[PDB]
Write a protein that binds this ligand. Structure first.
Ligand SMILES: CCCCCCCC(=O)c1c(O)cc(O)cc1CC(=O)OCC
Lengths: 231, 234
C-alpha cells in the first residue's frame, strides 16, 4: 500500500534516473596499471565512499517511521549498514555486461579505473551484480530490499522490538508484492548472506588502506570503521 | 672462534628443529579442505602455532648477548615489533617449498593443503618466499645474524635506543667479519632485494589475523592480540 509507494519514492530520490547520468570522466581504456595502487586511487576510493553518505541518509529518513526512531538508534543502524547499502545500490545500478560501475551521484567508471582503487573486492561486486541481474529484481522489491538490509538489528539497540515491528511489516509487503505479481522470495533474501560477506571484503580492504596510509580516510569513514569493529 | 657467531648460532640451532626429532604424527601430504571457509580447529591450531612461535623466539632472544641485559620494557618491544616479520622468515628457510611441507620451530610438519583452511592464500606466498630464499642458498651463520638484525633494530618506543643501536653495530661487525672469512657485501645486497617480499607477507599476515579477529570463532590469545594492537599505527 502506502509503504510500497513511500519506499519507491525515497529510493528513486536516492539514485540517478536513466536520464540523469554523467560520463564526464568515463574512459573504457586505462593506461598501464603501473606497479599497484597509487595515492590517486586511494583518495578516489575515499571520495566515492564519501559520495554515498548524504544519499543513503535522506533515503533512510524518507522511509515510513525511520525519523520516529531515537536519535542514537538511527545513527547506529545507518553507521553499521552504510557499507552494505552503498554496495547493494551500486551493484543493482551498474552494468556487468560491459563492466560499467554506475554510482548513485550519476558518474560512471569502467572496472579498470576502479581496480587499483578498490582491490579484489570489486570482482565479488561484479559476481554478486550479475547474480542480482540474473534474478532481475523489480524496482518496488528493490526499494523494499534496500530498506530491509538497513532495517536490521545492530548490537546495542534501545528499541530493538520497534525496529523488528517495522522489518516484518516491510518483509511482509515484499512477500505480499512478490505474491501480488516463496522460493523466488527465499532466493531474493539469500543474497544478504553473500552481502554480509562482501561487506567483510570491504573492511578487509580498508584495514590495509589505513595501514598503507597513502591517503588517510575522511574523518566520518574513520568513525564508521572503528565503530563497526567488534574490537 | 669468532665467539659471538659461535655463541650466537648456538641460540639459533637450540631454537630450531633437528632432523631426527621432527613430528610426522599429524602429516597428510593430501587433504580435501572445503576451500573458502575454515573451522575453529584450523584457527585455534593456527593460534597455538603462533602463541608458541613467541616462546621459541623468546627462548631464542635470551641467548642474544646484551639482550637479557636490556630494560624489560625494551626486550618486550623488539620481540613484539619483529615477531611476525621473524615468524615468516624462520618458517621460509627451514620449510620445504619443493616438497609441500611447512616445518615449524616445534619440529611439526604439515602439508600446504592442511594449512589451506587454517592459514589461507597467505601461506602460498610464504612458500613462494622460501623458494626465492633457497635459490640464493644463504649459509647458516649469515642467516643467524639477519634474524637478529630484524629483531635488534630501531623500533618506535625504545627506552635505551642508543644501546639497541650499539648492539645493531655489534651484530654487523661479526657478519662483516664472516662475509670476509667465506669469500677469503654482495650476497647481502641480493638478499635485501626480496625484503619488500618480506614486508608484504607481514601486511598479508596482519590482514589474515584481521579477518579472523573479525571472524572471532576462537578469541586470539591476549599476547598475540597485544602484539597486533600495538603493531597498528592507529
Ligand atoms: C584472503 C587473504 C589474501 C589473499 C590474497 C588476495 C590479494 C590481497 O592481498 C588483497 C586482500 O587480501 C584484500 C583486499 O581487499 C585486496 C587485496 C588485493 C590487493 O591488495 O590489491 C592488489 C595488490
Amino acid at each position: 500500500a502506502n509503504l510500497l509507494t513511500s519506499l519507491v519514492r525515497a529510493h528513486l530520490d536516492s539514485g540517478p534516473s536513466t536520464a540523469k547520468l554523467d560520463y564526464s570522466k568515463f574512459q573504457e581504456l586505462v593506461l598501464p596499471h603501473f606497479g599497484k595502487e597509487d595515492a590517486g586511487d586511494v583518495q578516489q576510493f575515499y571520495d566515492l565512499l564519501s559520495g554515498s553518505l548524504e544519499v543513503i541518509r535522506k533515503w533512510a529518513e524518507k522511509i515510513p517511521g525511520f525519523a520516529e526512531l531515537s536519535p542514537a538508534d538511527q545513527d547506529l543502524l545507518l553507521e553499521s549498514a552504510f557499507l552494505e547499502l552503498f554496495i547493494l545500490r551500486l551493484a543493482y545500478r551498474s552494468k556487468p555486461g560491459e563492466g560499467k560501475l554506475i554510482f548513485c551521484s550519476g558518474l560512471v567508471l569502467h572496472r579498470l579505473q576502479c581496480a587499483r582503487g578498490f582491490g579484489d573486492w570489486i570482482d565479488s561486486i561484479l559476481a554478486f551484480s550479475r547474480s542480482l541481474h540474473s534474478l532481475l529484481v523489480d524496482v518496488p522489491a528493490f526499494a523494499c530490499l534496500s530498506a530491509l538490509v538497513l532495517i536490521t538489528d545492530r548490537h546495542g539497540l534501545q528499541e530493538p522490538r520497534r525496529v523488528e515491528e517495522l522489518q516484518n511489516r516491510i518483509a511482509s509487503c515484499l512477500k505480499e508484492h512478490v505474491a501480488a505479481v516463496a522460493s523466488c522470495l527465499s532466493r531474493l533474501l539469500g543474497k544478504l548472506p553473500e552481502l554480509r560477506t562482501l561487506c567483510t571484503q570491504g573492511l578487509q580492504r580498508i584495514f590495509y588502506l589505513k595501514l598503507e596510509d597513502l591517503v588517510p580516510p575522511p574523518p566520518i569513514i574513520d568513525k564508521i570503521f572503528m565503530d563497526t569493529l567488534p574490537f
